[PDB]
Assembly symmetry: none
Homo-oligomer: 40 residues x 9
Amino acid sequence: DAEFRHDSGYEVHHQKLVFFAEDVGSNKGAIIGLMVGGVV
Amino acid sequence: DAEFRHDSGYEVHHQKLVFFAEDVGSNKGAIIGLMVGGVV
Amino acid sequence: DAEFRHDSGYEVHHQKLVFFAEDVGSNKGAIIGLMVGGVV
Amino acid sequence: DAEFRHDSGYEVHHQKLVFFAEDVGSNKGAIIGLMVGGVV
Amino acid sequence: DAEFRHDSGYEVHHQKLVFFAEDVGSNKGAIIGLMVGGVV
Amino acid sequence: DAEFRHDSGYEVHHQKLVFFAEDVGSNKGAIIGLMVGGVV
Amino acid sequence: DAEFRHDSGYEVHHQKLVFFAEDVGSNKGAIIGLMVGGVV
Amino acid sequence: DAEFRHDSGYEVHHQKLVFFAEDVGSNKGAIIGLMVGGVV
Amino acid sequence: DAEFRHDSGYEVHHQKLVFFAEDVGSNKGAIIGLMVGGVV
């Protein structure tokens, strides 16, 4: 029979990162625009 | 028979990150725009 | 029978990076534009 | 006679756009920053 | 007589665009930074 | 008589574009930086 | 004797700027993102 | 004796700028992204 | 005795600029990305 267009394209994400493990916390500047595991 | 378009595209997310483990808490600047595991 | 166009192109991502493991936290400059595991 | 500076610069706007006419409503991502007919 | 500076420079805008007329609505990514008919 | 500088330079804009007329809506990537009819 | 890490990095700011001294107030556009003497 | 790492890197700022001293205020466009004396 | 690493690198800034001293304020375009005395 007639088969119309089927919607799809499911997203799936799973990261695993380490940030600032062993480090002093002196007067650090301003860090930004930082992002991971995804878009926008 | 006639089959109309079926809606789909389910999202699924699951991260695991480490932030500031062992570090002093001196006068740190302003960190922002920080985001992970998702969009926007 | 007639087969219309089927929608597809599902995305899937999974990284694993290490950032700033063993390092002092002196007056570091401003780091930005940093991103991984994805687009935009 | 003496003529001081006259204030002016009146704004006027009038658009006409079509957004999402005939389209399924599956799991669409997040659209933003979208704006028209004006500033800011 | 003496004629001081007259203020002016009136803005006027009027577009007409078509966005997403006939298209399925599958799992579309995130569209942004989209703008027309104006500044900023 | 004395004629001081007169302010001017009025802007005027009017485009007409077609975007995504007849096209499927599969898993499209992320489109950005898109802009027309103006500056910035 | 043993001397643990001492917290420090005190901030201090003091500017002095002039904005819009002698100027008419016609239909000025929208100015934003304007900031000084500090971060964020 | 044993001397552990001392936290430091104090910030200090002090500018002095002139903006728009003697100028008419006609229909000026939209100025933005302007900043000084600091980061971000 | 044992001397661990000492945190340092204090920032200090002090500019002095003149912007738009004597100039008419006609329909000026949109100026941006303007910044001085600092980073980012």
